[PDB]
């Protein structure tokens, strides 16, 4: 057992899920965090079909505009454009290095990516989006996370992954946490 609690991960004692689920917490405002996100996607493809995966965006990393960034990811969901724009937010941050300063620049980013201001406006003001921004923010609070990217397995074990220099070891910890209760 290469992985053990207190060394490869810690237990939040949070409300664990009845089935295997993995959630990633990240912020569009951290170029280094955004770079790790991709690695989490590698875990998704590697994750066992039995295990479920989930995504979480934190507004506390954003700061004064954290609330806007959370709504923006939810807005993508209304437009079915999460996969496309999601990385656009990380690119613009981790690559263009031009993070949105207001909701206005944020609107231009979506339209630049081929999305409409009309449908994006319907999504940003959709009651569903606002509900999702609150949802993920709660996930980080219960998870006891102090900085993304953070990975939670069964919403109860937190992956340190420090020992795993290579995804093979980091992935293996996630696999055990999926079976941890």
Swiss-Prot record:
A Pfam family of the record is DSBA
Q: List the disulfide bonds.
A: 30-33
Q: Which residues form the Thioredoxin domain?
A: 1-179
Q: Where is this gene product found?
A: Periplasm
Q: Which domain of life is it from?
A: Bacteria
Quick check: keyword Glycosyltransferase in the entry? no
Question: Which GO MF terms does the UniProt record name?
Answer: protein disulfide isomerase activity; protein-disulfide reductase activity
List the record's Gene Ontology CC terms alphabetically.
outer membrane-bounded periplasmic space
According to UniProt, the name of this protein is Thiol:disulfide interchange protein DsbA
Q: What does the record give as the function of this protein?
A: Involved in disulfide-bond formation. Required for the functional maturation of secreted virulence factors. Acts by transferring its disulfide bond to other proteins.
Gene name, Swiss-Prot/TrEMBL: dsbA
Tell me its family.
Answer: Belongs to the thioredoxin family. DsbA subfamily.
Q: Which Gene3D superfamilies match?
A: Glutaredoxin
Gene Ontology biological process terms, A to Z: cellular response to antibiotic
Record keywords, A-Z: Disulfide bond, Periplasm, Redox-active center, Signal, Virulence
């Amino acid at each position: 057992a290469q992985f053990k609690e207190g060394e490869h991960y810690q237990v939040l004692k949070t409300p664990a899920s009845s089935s295997p689920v993995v959630s990633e917490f990240f912020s569009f405002y951290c170029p280094h965090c955004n770079t790790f996100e991709p690695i989490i996607a590698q875990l998704k493809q590697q994750l066992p079909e039995g295990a479920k995966f989930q995504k979480n965006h934190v507004s506390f990393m954003g700061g004064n505009m954290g609330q806007a960034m959370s709504k923006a990811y939810a807005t993508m969901i209304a437009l079915e454009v999460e996969d496309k724009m999601v990385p656009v937010m990380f690119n613009r941050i981790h690559t263009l290095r031009k993070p949105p300063k207001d909701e206005q620049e944020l609107r231009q980013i979506f339209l630049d990516e081929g999305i409409d201001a009309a449908k994006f406006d319907a999504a940003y003001n959709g009651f569903a989006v606002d509900s999702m921004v609150r949802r993920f923010d709660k996930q980080f609070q219960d998870s006891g996370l102090t900085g993304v990217p953070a990975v939670v397995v069964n919403n109860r074990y937190l992956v340190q992954g420090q020992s795993a220099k290579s995804l093979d070891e980091y992935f293996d910890l996630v696999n055990y946490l999926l079976t941890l209760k």
